[PDB]
């Protein structure tokens, strides 16, 4: 990595004192992970950040997030975890963000999208309409050989990662190290997360004259699984990613499906 | 007051509570008005009762028009924010609120909202718009004073 | 009670002011004498003209005599394809200034081109090409000069008379609301 | 429901300011709204009925009470609030009657009682006698200047001394001052701008 | 390709009717509102020059994407950072071609017609300017597509040897536009006494989306083009009209 990450992590270390109330709530998560171990021998790792001190610290970083979020969230991702280690050193894992938001000018209802609002933080609302099912998903695989001792490792991430894009690894089955070995896939020690795609359309009360509704489909991951029933009035915040190939890879009409990689799915009652 | 924009600004309501006890209400139940009762008063009335009273009659609690929600929504994007939905009038009221309170932290916010909507009534006054719906009723005077001046210059230059 | 606009000049009262400034003509009626007279109040000379010898009259008479073709409006010093090119290349290399305009900038480019279009050197794509080009360079710096307005002071060093009578009711109605906030908070 | 009639008279008046504003004249002033006036004037008779009611009782039962001085300080105010809504309305209706006597009355007519302001019903009895005296105040001014007799019209600057004037469908051969015109329908002229401005305003000769 | 920009760049700057010239006042008032288009009346092209319209009438698919870059070199003579490619919207009135007689001769020719719109579709995304990196070499590049002829006419290359098509599209730095996919039915007063009313499917670009409700009477000026998907014959294509400029009536 560059200095482009380098100064960028350092400025998110000045975000622990001006609004140090966020540094209080990290310990409260570390409280319930100890006192549950005191009864046996629940809380997620998601920190609600108001998008309100960022106007009062740096206007060139607050307007940075709402324009190109694939370059400022993964820096602020790793900056939070090292502060989530140095304060809490007793026990021996993403630590995601939320963005409460103080909702900006990207407050667009799902009828007005897709044109210049790619790669931004939209705040879409509406009525949920499909509610698909839950399946697990592989992230890390730890192999183990018992003829030479040591464990092993394999990262594996899909195109629906946290925010960015990298070289896609179609890792079916990592086996057969540089020896004569029959490697073993340790379950339990590996990691798995949940995955659920729901589709949301616009509200029929704020609709225009008689037409068909236009829906948009949002991916939820790592925390918000089984949060809303179908047929609820839901406000969602995410990043308007757009993945897939538009028929240019298969050497041969329509193309480029769009998704939202949601964070805060926040039920409303109005 | 001979101006009609000045008379209409007084009719707004403000959530202000009492301090004393009064045996009479021109508005109905229980003519002794008990103290620590909260009412909404017109600004022609709760503007002279906040001074004359050392304790005055009316406490004059702050409204939602200047709450922290509105004061945070106008620091993000002053262009595409509604001002015809709050009540209807903003600049004729937020001047009156400053004089009866003397706050130096509101006058550095309205003086930046006013510049950012100023720069986009000179662009849209060059002769298909939604900016007739989300303008402030104090700005719809200078929009019809500007757009009918560029029109009478572009008319004269070509026959 | 005028009651139409009542605080600005309407742009038919701007062609009334520019028509009081003198230019030169090449007359075609002598009336000098050899050895009945124009006796107006405000000019009262130049009864004595010679055929094709330059003299200097006020501008509102020299539009009366062009309609009958007894005169010919000469060009000023600025209606020149060699002179307006310096006043354009000044504007690109100095993004803060206004280059220079003889203060009848737009108005004398209208009353001359409609009425007197036989006396220049090729107005087709040589003078209406530059004058519209010099009005669109100039109307950028006015638009960038309004993000910087304050409540005490402003400088507008060299602007014409018609680029101001479209800009008064915007500025003096906004800067009267930036005055009543800074002094109401004190 | 205490000064609500102030907010119904004022918003009624804001309509007439925006029929004068953009492009059109305010020929046909709408109406004198009088039923909302009588409802306002009933309440200021009622609010006088209480301030004399407390005047006897403050000399017998209250005996100069400071809490009782608040009712003199509140019922004074609603007299002001309905005074201001009743002067903002009848000044706004005055200046349009000031402009209409200043553009198209006394202009090549020299005594125009009828034939102009064709309503004569939307004005009250008091606003119809204010106007008729005001037009005699104008003719005092045009008799002591002699810049021009009836200096009223033509605030357009003069240009192009000889104009073309086309008759739009109004016969009569009416004019006698500065010569007869022998006016026939649809026949255009070449006359100077001094003699037609007294007829171009009557809706009588269409072209400039 | 060469110098046909300058024969059009002088058309925008120098076209002028009697007193007030239009295409430097329609280009300036469509930037302050942030509208980013232009409307060329097609009679004013052939009055100014006939050699320009001779090229545009013969081969329109290769020259209208040359006029779109001749506008965006003029809008940098007025504004002085992000100015996209402008869009060209044109309209005219020669003679309507009825919807029934569209032969095999009108392939890639400017054609106007009329009808009633049945249905619309949901919006989509087409790519204009995308960024590619190789998986092994990691040699970055940038392909900018501007022409529109629906499936694939410009694709990824095969080498910067390396493998079959080693290229990846990166989704973090690109630009996208919209498409609309209408359908259009002929007017029932040109009655098919023994036939059913036919229909065609159009496309629309970025600034004509969401303009027309189903059930109106429109007049449509476009390029009658062809595309060869298999979504029933041998070497069979399918027809469709690439709309550039929908002149609807008053909507009423």
Swiss-Prot record, chain A:
Q: How does it assemble?
A: Component of the MCM2-7 complex. The complex forms a toroidal hexameric ring with the proposed subunit order MCM2-MCM6-MCM4-MCM7-MCM3-MCM5; loaded onto DNA, forms a head-head double hexamer. Interacts with CSM1.
Q: Which domain of life is it from?
A: Eukaryota
The entry's keywords: ATP-binding, DNA replication, DNA-binding, Helicase, Hydrolase, Nucleotide-binding, Nucleus, Phosphoprotein
The keyword Nucleus appears for this protein: yes
Recorded protein name is DNA replication licensing factor MCM3
**Record's function text:** Acts as a component of the MCM2-7 complex (MCM complex) which is the putative replicative helicase essential for 'once per cell cycle' DNA replication initiation and elongation in eukaryotic cells. The active ATPase sites in the MCM2-7 ring are formed through the interaction surfaces of two neighboring subunits such that a critical structure of a conserved arginine finger motif is provided in trans relative to the ATP-binding site of the Walker A box of the adjacent subunit. The six ATPase active sites, however, are likely to contribute differentially to the complex helicase activity.
Q: What else is known?
A: Present with 35100 molecules/cell in log phase SD medium.
Which taxonomic lineage is given here?
Answer: Eukaryota, Fungi, Dikarya, Ascomycota, Saccharomycotina
Species of origin: Saccharomyces cerevisiae (strain ATCC 204508 / S288c)
Q: Which family does it belong to?
A: Belongs to the MCM family.
**An annotated Gene Ontology molecular function:** ATP binding
Question: Does the record bear Ubl conjugation in its keywords?
Answer: no
Where is it mainly found?
nucleus
Q: Which residues of the full protein are shown?
A: 17 to 331 of 971
A GO cellular component annotation in the UniProt record? chromosome, telomeric region
User: Where does the record say this protein resides?
Assistant: Nucleus
Swiss-Prot record, chain B:
Is Nucleus there in the keyword field?
yes
Q: Name one GO biological process term.
A: mitotic DNA replication initiation
Q: Report the transmembrane regions from the record.
A: none
Q: Name one Pfam family in it.
A: Sld5
Q: Which domain of life is it from?
A: Eukaryota
Tell me where it resides.
Nucleus
State the Gene3D superfamilies in the record: 1.20.58.2050
Keyword Nucleus tagged: yes
Question: What Gene Ontology terms describe where this protein resides (cellular component)?
Answer: CMG complex; DNA replication preinitiation complex; GINS complex; nuclear replication fork; nucleus
Q: Which UniProt keywords apply?
A: DNA replication, Nucleus
Q: Which InterPro entries match?
A: GINS_A, GINS_bundle-like_dom_sf, GINS_Psf3, GINS_Psf3_sf, PSF3_N
Q: Anything further noted?
A: Present with 2205 molecules/cell in log phase SD medium.
Write out the similarity annotation: Belongs to the GINS3/PSF3 family.
Q: How does it assemble?
A: Component of the GINS complex which is a heterotetramer of SLD5, PSF1, PSF2 and PSF3.
Function (record text) = Functions as part of the GINS complex which plays an essential role in the initiation of DNA replication by binding to DNA replication origins and facilitating the assembly of the DNA replication machinery.
**What is this protein called in UniProt?**
DNA replication complex GINS protein PSF3
| Taxonomic source organism | Saccharomyces cerevisiae (strain ATCC 204508 / S288c)
Q: Which gene encodes it?
A: PSF3
UniProtKB/Swiss-Prot annotation, chain C:
One example of a Gene Ontology biological process annotation = double-strand break repair via break-induced replication
* Keywords associated with the record: DNA replication, Nucleus
The subcellular localization recorded is: Nucleus
The yes or no answer to whether the keyword DNA repair is present is: no
Give a GO cellular-component term. Answer: nucleus
Question: Known InterPro entries for this protein?
Answer: GINS_A, GINS_bundle-like_dom_sf, GINS_Psf2, PSF2_N
Chief subcellular location = nucleus
Q: What is annotated about its quaternary structure and interactions?
A: Component of the GINS complex which is a heterotetramer of SLD5, PSF1, PSF2 and PSF3. Interacts with PSF1 and SLD5.
Q: Which family does it belong to?
A: Belongs to the GINS2/PSF2 family.
| Biological role stated in the UniProt entry | Functions as part of the GINS complex which plays an essential role in the initiation of DNA replication by binding to DNA replication origins and facilitating the assembly of the DNA replication machinery.
Protein name in UniProt:
DNA replication complex GINS protein PSF2
From Swiss-Prot, chain D:
- Per the record, the major location class is nucleus
Protein's cellular compartments = Nucleus
Q: InterPro entries, alphabetically?
A: GINS_A, GINS_bundle-like_dom_sf, GINS_Psf1, PSF1_C
User: This chain belongs to which protein, by name?
Assistant: DNA replication complex GINS protein PSF1
Q: Which GO terms describe its cellular component?
A: CMG complex; DNA replication preinitiation complex; GINS complex; nuclear replication fork; nucleus
Query: What else is on record for this protein?
Result: Present with 1431 molecules/cell in log phase SD medium.
Similarity comment: Belongs to the GINS1/PSF1 family.
Q: Which GO terms describe its biological process?
A: DNA strand elongation involved in mitotic DNA replication; DNA-templated DNA replication; double-strand break repair via break-induced replication
Q: How does it assemble?
A: Component of the GINS complex which is a heterotetramer of SLD5, PSF1, PSF2 and PSF3. Interacts with PSF2.
The UniProt keyword set, sorted, is: Cell cycle, DNA replication, Nucleus
What's the domain of life for this entry? Eukaryota
Q: Cross-referenced Pfam families, in alphabetical order?
A: PSF1_C (PF24997), Sld5 (PF05916)
Record function comment: Required for DNA replication. Functions as part of the GINS complex which plays an essential role in the initiation of DNA replication by binding to DNA replication origins and facilitating the assembly of the DNA replication machinery. Required for the chromatin binding of CDC45.
């Amino acid at each position: 990595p560059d200095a482009v990450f380098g100064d960028r992590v350092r400025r998110f270390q000045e975000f622990l004192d001006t609004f140090t109330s966020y540094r209080d709530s990290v310990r409260s998560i570390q409280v319930y992970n100890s006192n549950n171990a005191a009864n046996y021998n629940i809380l997620p790792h998601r920190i609600i950040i108001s998008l309100d001190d960022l106007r009062e610290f740096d206007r060139s970083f607050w307007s940075g997030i709402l324009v190109e979020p694939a370059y400022f969230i993964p820096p602020a991702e790793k900056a939070l975890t090292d502060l989530a280690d140095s304060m809490d050193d007793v026990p021996h894992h993403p630590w995601k963000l939320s963005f409460k938001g103080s909702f900006g000018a990207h407050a667009l209802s799902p009828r007005t999208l897709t044109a210049q609002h790619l790669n931004k933080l939209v705040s879409v609302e509406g009525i949920v309409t499909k509610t698909s099912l839950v399946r697990p998903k592989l992230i890390r695989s730890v192999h183990y050989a018992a003829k030479t001792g040591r464990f092993h490792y394999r990262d594996y991430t899909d195109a629906t990662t946290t925010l960015t894009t990298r070289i896609p690894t179609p890792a079916i089955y990592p086996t057969e190290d540089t020896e004569g070995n029959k490697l073993t896939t340790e379950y339990g020690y590996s990691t798995f997360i949940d995955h659920q795609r729901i589709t949301v359309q616009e509200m029929p009360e704020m609709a225009p004259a008689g037409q068909l509704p236009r829906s948009i489909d949002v991916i939820l991951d790592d925390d918000l699984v089984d949060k809303t029933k179908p047929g609820d009035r839901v406000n969602v915040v995410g990043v308007f990613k757009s993945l897939g190939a538009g028929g240019m890879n298969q050497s041969n009409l329509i193309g480029f499906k769009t998704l939202i990689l949601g964070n805060t799915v926040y039920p409303l009652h109005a | 007051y001979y101006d009609i924009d000045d008379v209409l600004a007084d009719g707004t309501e403000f959530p202000c509570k009492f301090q004393y006890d009064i045996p009479g209400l021109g508005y109905n139940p229980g003519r002794p008005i008990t103290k620590n009762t909260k009412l909404s008063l017109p600004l022609w009335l709760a503007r002279i009762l906040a001074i004359v009273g050392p304790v005055p009659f009316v406490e004059l609690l702050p409204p939602d028009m200047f709450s922290t929600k509105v004061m945070n929504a106008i620091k993000t994007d002053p262009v595409a924010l509604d001002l015809h939905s709050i009540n209807s009038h903003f600049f004729s009221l937020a001047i009156k609120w400053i004089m009866l309170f003397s706050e130096k932290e509101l006058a550095n916010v309205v003086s930046e909202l006013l510049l950012q909507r100023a720069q986009e009534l000179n662009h849209h006054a060059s002769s298909t718009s939604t900016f007739l719906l989300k303008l402030e009723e104090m700005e719809k005077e200078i929009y019809k004073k500007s757009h009918e001046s560029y029109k009478d210059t572009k008319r004269w230059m070509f026959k | 009670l005028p009651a139409h606009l009542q605080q600005t000049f309407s742009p038919e009262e701007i062609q009334f002011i520019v028509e009081n400034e003198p230019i030169k003509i090449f007359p075609r009626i002598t009336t000098r004498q050899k050895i009945w007279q124009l006796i107006t109040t405000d000019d009262k000379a130049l009864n004595n003209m010679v055929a094709m010898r330059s003299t200097e009259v006020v501008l509102w008479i020299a539009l009366l005599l062009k309609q009958q073709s007894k005169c010919s409006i000469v060009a000023p010093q600025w209606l020149t394809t060699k002179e307006l090119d310096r006043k354009i290349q000044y504007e690109k290399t100095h993004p803060d200034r206004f280059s220079e305009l003889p203060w009848n900038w737009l108005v004398l480019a209208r009353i001359l081109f409609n009425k007197a279009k036989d006396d220049f050197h090729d107005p087709i794509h040589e003078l209406r090409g530059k004058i519209q080009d010099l009005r669109e360079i100039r109307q950028i710096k006015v638009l960038k000069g309004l993000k910087y307005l304050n409540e005490s002071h402003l400088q507008l060093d060299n602007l014409s008379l018609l680029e101001i009578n479209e800009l008064r009711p915007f500025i003096t109605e906004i800067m009267d609301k930036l005055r009543e906030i800074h002094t109401a908070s004190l | 429901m205490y000064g609500d009639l102030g907010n119904k008279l004022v918003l009624e008046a804001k309509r007439t300011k925006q029929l004068y504003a953009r492009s059109n004249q305010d020929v046909n002033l709408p109406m004198y709204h009088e039923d909302i006036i009588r409802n306002i004037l009933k309440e200021v008779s009622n609010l006088r009925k209480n301030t004399e009611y407390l005047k006897e009782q403050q000399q017998l039962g209250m005996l100069d009470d400071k809490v009782a001085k608040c009712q003199y300080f509140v019922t004074l105010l609603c007299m002001e609030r309905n005074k201001r809504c009743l002067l903002a309305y009848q000044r706004l209706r005055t200046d349009i009657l000031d402009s209409m006597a200043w553009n198209n009355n006394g202009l090549d007519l020299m005594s125009s009682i009828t034939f102009s302001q064709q309503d004569t019903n939307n004005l009250s009895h008091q606003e119809q006698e204010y106007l008729k005296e005001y037009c005699d105040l104008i003719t005092d001014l045009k008799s002591g200047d002699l810049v021009d007799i009836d200096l009223s019209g033509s605030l357009v600057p003069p240009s192009d001394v000889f104009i073309d004037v086309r008759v739009l469908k109004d016969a009569g051969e009416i004019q006698t001052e500065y010569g007869v015109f022998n006016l026939i329908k649809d026949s255009q002229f070449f006359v100077r701008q001094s003699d037609v401005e007294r007829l171009i305003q009557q809706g009588y000769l269409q072209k400039i | 390709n060469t110098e046909i920009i300058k024969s059009f760049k002088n058309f925008i700057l120098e076209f002028r009717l009697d007193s007030q010239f239009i295409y430097r006042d329609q280009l300036r008032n469509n930037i302050l509102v942030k509208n980013y288009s232009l409307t060329v009346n097609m009679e004013h092209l052939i009055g100014y020059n006939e050699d320009i319209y001779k090229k545009l009438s013969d081969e329109p698919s290769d020259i209208i994407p040359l006029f779109e870059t001749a506008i965006t070199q003029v809008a940098k003579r007025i504004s002085i950072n992000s100015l996209p490619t402008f869009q060209l919207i044109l309209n005219s009135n020669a003679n309507q071609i009825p919807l029934r007689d569209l032969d095999s001769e009108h392939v890639s020719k400017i054609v106007r017609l009329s009808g009633i719109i049945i249905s619309t579709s949901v919006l989509s995304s087409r790519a204009t300017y995308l960024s590619i990196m190789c998986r092994n070499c990691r040699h970055t590049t940038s392909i900018t597509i501007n022409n529109f002829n629906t499936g694939n006419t410009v694709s990824l290359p095969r080498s910067c040897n390396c493998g079959p098509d080693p290229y990846i599209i990166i989704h973090e730095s690109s630009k996208f536009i919209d498409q609309q996919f209408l359908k259009l039915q002929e007017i029932p007063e040109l009655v098919p006494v023994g036939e059913m009313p036919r229909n065609l499917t159009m496309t629309c670009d970025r600034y004509l989306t969401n303009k027309v409700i189903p059930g109106t009477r429109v007049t449509i000026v476009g390029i009658y083009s062809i595309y060869n998907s298999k979504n029933s014959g041998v070497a069979i294509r399918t027809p469709y009209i690439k709309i550039l400029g929908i002149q609807s009536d008053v909507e009423t």
